């Protein structure tokens, strides 16, 4: 049940430093407490790793970069818990401000490895409506059937290679459509875990 | 490609809560839960569907649709629902 | 129309209010004709 985005596994550009399972490991980021008042989160594609382990050394100390990903979200929820998530990968996710000041803060366009909570998830923070977000690659997390969502994303960009600290290809959004609910005497914060695994990564332009 | 319908489009209901149909406990049997016309291209719950928008970029259309429903309650919660479709000729049925 | 066939039964310690999410699409026989501008 791994949603292979656009039906394309990430591949090596035919014939650059091609790392291996040392960098192609499973980075398990911090968990995020899913509450009822929760609105959502989003992580940029390579910005979520630019300061985490070996991938943070291969990205900053280089000039060109391309790689897929293996985003994998899991929710350690009970059986008396109810709710639903929409886990979608948005290519070229461009964040927009909200004028009653015109341009998004840098903390909101490159949140790091912690993600930025949505301020208006109904409009995906990008003007476009959340109702049509399913046109992107996505997978539902419905606590009554399954609590896992794996998305395989290739490298989607115009140029073959591009910068890794400036241009963030996509953004993994996680939005609760049906809010969390539970009777008294339960874990009031369902944890959400995210695992990343760069697939077929490449690099160029050392130092 | 399936997208969400704002079936709960109602005066006052704001935010993402317009995409949710409330199914509660003390709703006695044979009562009505929700209803929405099948018109992808007229102002209504279909106006938030990829079909409901593209069909507004054209003049005429004809085909078959589909409405996948999804329950988002607890795993222990059980019950049963009746989902009926009425052709264009008749009107909305009055009783279960 | 969506009718309440039965009631909504739950065991103890379980929320008594859920949600239904509807998703719409078009089958493989859909057709379009006479492209024109929109009304936003």
């Amino acid at each position: 049940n791994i949603v292979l985005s656009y039906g394309e596994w990430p591949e090596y550009c035919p014939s650059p430093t091609r790392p291996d399972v040392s960098v192609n490991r499973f980075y398990t980021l911090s968990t995020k407490s899913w509450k009822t008042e929760s609105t959502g989160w989003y992580w940029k594609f390579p910005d979520v790793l630019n300061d985490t382990g070996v991938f943070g050394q291969n990205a900053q100390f280089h000039y060109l970069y391309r790689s897929g990903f293996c985003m994998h979200v899991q929710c350690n929820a009970s059986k008396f818990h109810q709710g639903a998530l929409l886990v979608a990968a948005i290519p070229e996710f461009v964040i927009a401000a909200s004028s009653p000041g015109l341009y998004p803060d840098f903390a909101h366009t490159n949140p790091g490895k912690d993600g930025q909570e949505f301020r208006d998830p109904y409009v995906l923070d990008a003007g476009i409506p959340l109702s049509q977000a399913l046109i992107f690659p996505h997978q539902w997390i419905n606590l009554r059937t399954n609590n896992c969502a794996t998305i395989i994303m290739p490298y989607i960009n115009a140029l073959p290679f591009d910068s890794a600290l400036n241009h963030s290809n996509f953004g993994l959004v996680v939005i609760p459509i049906s809010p969390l609910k539970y009777c008294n005497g339960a874990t009031t914060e369902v944890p959400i875990t995210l695992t990343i695994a760069p697939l077929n990564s490449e690099f160029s332009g050392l130092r | 490609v399936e997208t969400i319908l704002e079936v709960n489009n109602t005066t006052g209901t704001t935010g993402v809560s317009r995409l949710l149909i409330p199914v509660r406990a003390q709703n006695n049997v044979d009562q009505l839960c929700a209803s929405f016309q099948v018109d992808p291209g007229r102002n209504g719950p279909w106006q938030s569907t990829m079909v409901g928008q593209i069909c507004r970029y054209y003049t005429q259309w004809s085909g078959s649709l589909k409405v996948t429903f999804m329950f988002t309650g607890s795993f222990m919660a059980t019950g049963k629902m009746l989902i009926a479709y009425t052709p264009p000729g008749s009107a909305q049925p009055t009783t279960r | 129309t969506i009718w309440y066939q039965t009631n909504f039964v739950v065991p103890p310690d379980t929320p008594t209010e859920a949600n239904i999410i509807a998703l719409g699409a078009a089958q493989k026989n859909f057709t379009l004709k006479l492209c024109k501008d929109t009304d936003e």
Epitope: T36, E37, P179, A186 | - | -
Partner: nanobody, 120 residues
Framework: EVKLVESGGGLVKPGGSLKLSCAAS????????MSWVRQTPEKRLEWVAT????????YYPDSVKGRFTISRDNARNTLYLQMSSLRSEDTALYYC?????????????????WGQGTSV
């Protein structure tokens, strides 16, 4: 049952602070969005303030809009409401109940169960 109880009110000089407690139990006080309603001496219930279901969002009507400061313990099962420099015509039986514009699966328990109401 949804047992809510308000307490912590009384007389105070115009200009100061006087909090209010709405410690409630018998229901999950971690998912419901509560709010505060004031019953003036003219027997006209007016909205005072609200709080989200996790104590992060807040809508302040034109009654205070900068003076009253609501909160939510959410662990000691209590609800706070500040009265920073209350006005002259601000005496009322400040009730507390459920209901909130947040918590998407709302609009059902909109002030369903109420408290008791403490005077000022």
């Amino acid at each position: 049952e949804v047992k809510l109880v308000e307490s912590g009110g009384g007389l105070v000089k115009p200009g100061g602070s006087l909090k209010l407690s709405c410690a409630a139990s018998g229901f999950a006080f971690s998912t419901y969005d509560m709010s505060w309603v004031r019953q003036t001496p003219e027997k006209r219930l007016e909205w005072v303030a609200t709080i989200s279901s996790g104590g992060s969002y807040t809508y302040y009507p034109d009654s205070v809009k900068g003076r009253f400061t609501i909160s939510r313990d959410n662990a000691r099962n209590t609800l706070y409401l500040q009265m920073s420099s209350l006005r002259s015509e601000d005496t009322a039986l400040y009730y507390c109940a459920r209901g909130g514009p947040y918590d998407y699966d709302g609009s059902f328990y909109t002030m369903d169960y109420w408290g008791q109401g403490t005077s000022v």
